Symmetry: C4
Subunit: 92 residues, 4 copies
């Protein structure tokens, strides 16, 4: 499934970029920076906000450019990969 892999690669790259940015500029531990990237792009959010003007501007751009991609990835992780499995049982 190429599109799955493609959306996966772009998401991975997006999250790597976010992890690097927030670990460097906002000073988060790598794991916390990946968490922040993930909850931002899925719109889940969390209890902290960037506190540098650079972090705020980057987050604005990051959100606008990443939400669509991660939403597409979540969609296919659910429908091209998850739906079939569901049918694997509910029909004999």
């Amino acid at each position: 499934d190429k599109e799955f892999q493609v959306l996966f690669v772009l998401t991975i790259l997006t999250l790597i970029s976010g992890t690097i940015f927030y670990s460097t500029v906002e000073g988060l531990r790598p794991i916390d920076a990946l968490y922040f990237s993930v909850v931002t792009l899925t719109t889940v959010g969390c209890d902290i906000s960037p506190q540098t003007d650079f972090g705020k501007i980057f987050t604005i751009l990051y959100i606008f450019i990443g939400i669509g991609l991660v939403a597409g990835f979540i969609h296919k992780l659910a429908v091209n990969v998850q739906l079939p499995s569901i049918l694997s049982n509910l029909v004999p």
Copy 2:
């Protein structure tokens, strides 16, 4: 309505898993753990974040795997079960 029941079962199982995980690893009361699972997977969020690295990693995986499912469930709870009722009045 099979698909409704199926989405319902998978959602229940997802939420049970989350309740168990967050009550065990993050140490939340069962009710708070279910709340956290629910607001996470609907992307509503809340004022607390996991504070163990295990909780953060699990939440990343949980979000990615659960959002699609709960969104589908919410869709059908609204359209295969809620829309008809609406027509039950607005047309004689």
Copy 3:
């Protein structure tokens, strides 16, 4: 536009119910209770969480039953009512 009015009425009723519930059980001012209802059902969220077990259970049910409705309402407020206006200028 009937469906607009219908989605509007159901949303109003949903928000009224939320305002009453959160002003009574969580003890919020009416305006804060309406804010909480609105940011919950649009998944925007805010910096506070219900602190009674009754408020948490109600919010779980409220979210599951209301998000679909408000999403439909937001969709039509944007497409059956907002899109035409946009065309009102960008084409002579």
Copy 4:
């Protein structure tokens, strides 16, 4: 691509309006006011809430009127402008 530009213009105007409102009434720095507008309309949210009744009422209206628009803009920024680029490599 006209629709892209149109959605872009309406989004810019929406965000400008939010920046002005929150910098004036809630007293946020311009950059923080734009951040608040952006995380509100993308439903990402943040760790602060308006504290004037005027800010709460405006945010209710702002959300209802803006979410649809920004969602459409995010969609096209991802599909009319981002998808082609993706094909630019994954096919020779």
